[PDB]
C-alpha cells in the first residue's frame with residue numbers, strides 16, 4: 001500500500017531500521033512495517049512494569065500507597081524524580097508515575113523489584129497473552145540495544161496488541177486501566193516523537209524509549225476527536241553504537257500513518 005511504500009522510503013532516508021504497528025480499533029485493521037521483527041524496547045518496557053504492578057493492586061487494594069525507600073545506592077543513570085526523594089520514600093503509585101511520565105530508571109528498578117525481578121515482568125506479559133515480550137535485565141543495562149541481541153526486545157505487532165489490551169481492553173481492572181491511561185496522557189517526554197506528527201487536537205498517551213545504537217522508540221494510544229482510538233507503536237534503531245536519537249523519524253512515521261486515514 002501507499003503507506004507501506006512511504007514508510008519504506010522514510011526508513012531508507014533515515015539509515016536505520018524502522019518498525020511500526022498501527023491498530024485502528026474502528027475496524028480492528030492493522031498496518032505493520034517490520035511488524036514481526038524484534039526491536040530493543042528500552043524504556044517502552046516501563047509500561048509493562050507499571051501495568052504489572054497495577055494488576056497486583058487489583059487484589060492488594062492499598063498496594064499503590066505502599067511507601068518504598070529511595071536510597072543513594074538505588075540511583076542509576078537517569079533518575080529525575082527519584083533523585084528528589086533520596087533518603088525518603090515514594091509510593092508505588094508515585095514510582096509508577098515517575099517511570100512512565102519521566103522515564104525514571106530508578107523507579108523502573110523499584111517496579112521490577114516489586115514484581116520479583118525481570119521474570120516477574122515477563123510473566124505478566126505472558127499472563128495477558130503476550131508471548132513475545134521479554135524483559136531480561138534491569139536498568140540501565142536493558143538499554144544496550146545490541147543488534148541481534150534478543151534480550152529486552154519485543155516486536156511492534158506484539159507491543160501494539162498488548163498496549164491495546166492494557167489501555168482500551170480489559171487486561172486490567174477498570175480503576176487500574178483508567179489510572180494507566182491517565183499516566184500515559186500525562187507523559188512529559190513525548191513532545192518530539194509520535195505527538196509531533198499528529199494533529200494538535202488529538203489526545204495522545206505515550207511512552208518513549210531511547211537507548212544505545214540510536215534507538216528511538218515511542219508507543220502510543222491516540223484518541224482522535226470524533227473517531228475510534230488508534231494504537232501506534234514506532235520503534236527505530238541504527239547501526240552505529242553511538243548514533244544520535246532520531247525522534248523526527250517517529251514523528252514522520254506517525255504523520256504518514258495519520259495521512260492514510
Ligand SMILES: *[B@@]1([O])O[C][C]([C][O])O1
Nearest residue numbers: 042043078103209210
Ligand atoms: B528510557 O529508554 O527512557 C530514558 C531512559 C534513559 O536510560 O531509558
